[PDB]
Design a binder for this molecule. Sequence first.
Ligand SMILES: [Zn+2]
Lengths: 44, 79, 57, 48, 49
Amino acid sequence: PINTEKLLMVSLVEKACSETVIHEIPGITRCFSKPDTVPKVITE
Amino acid sequence: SDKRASAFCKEVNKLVLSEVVRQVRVTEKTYAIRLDLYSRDEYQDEYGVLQEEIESTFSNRFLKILNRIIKSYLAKSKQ
Amino acid sequence: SLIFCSECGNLLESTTAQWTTCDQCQSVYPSEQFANLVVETKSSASAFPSALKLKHS
Amino acid sequence: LLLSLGVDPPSVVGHESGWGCVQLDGKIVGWCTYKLAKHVADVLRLMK
Amino acid sequence: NEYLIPSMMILKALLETSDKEIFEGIVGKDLGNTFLTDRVELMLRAYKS
Ligand SMILES: [Zn+2]
């Protein structure tokens, strides 16, 4: 509706794209690989 | 193998739709928003989420989030 | 891309509702001259924290 | 000396894109392109 | 004590000004720069409130 005031669509869309997730296992992020010839995965 | 190592790594890792979008232009008037998404090749090097996955989750959850935050700001402006 | 009055400075109310008239000067203009105002709003660069930007910077 | 040297403070907006500001201890005295701003800075320093 | 009055209020209260002057003074340049133009519009209307 036109009676609605202007919207900061750039900031709102940045907030949306920054808040929405594709595949998250709940409470995990940043799985990383660090080198004894023992390949391991260090996850936050 | 290291290929499966990095595959599982991206698998259990979480990514945010901001991390695949390029600059997002929004034209005013209707009211129109257009997101630029990186080329599927460079997008699949650091990733391995497919195009259809983006399609589905983009549509559903992205519209949910966008409408939710617009309603938040509109209700803030109602006062 | 904004629609100011010419007698006063009062920014006119959006012609989408009805005719264009300033609340102080009460001045008249044809609303259809500047209809369909297009504003191409763009997102500022260096705004999405990426994991691939380092592959682009 | 600034008014003599190429800057002018307006009444209605005498300002455009490239023109940067010149500030006298919290008072806007003119506007000038950064090349002319640098020239003014140097010539003022040498006059001083 | 802190005190908080909107900047458009004192901007109009300071000189006998019309709104086109405030706009073309803040962002009179590069006519229609996106960010500045929409922010000043929103400000002007939020004070017109
Ligand atoms: Zn008017």
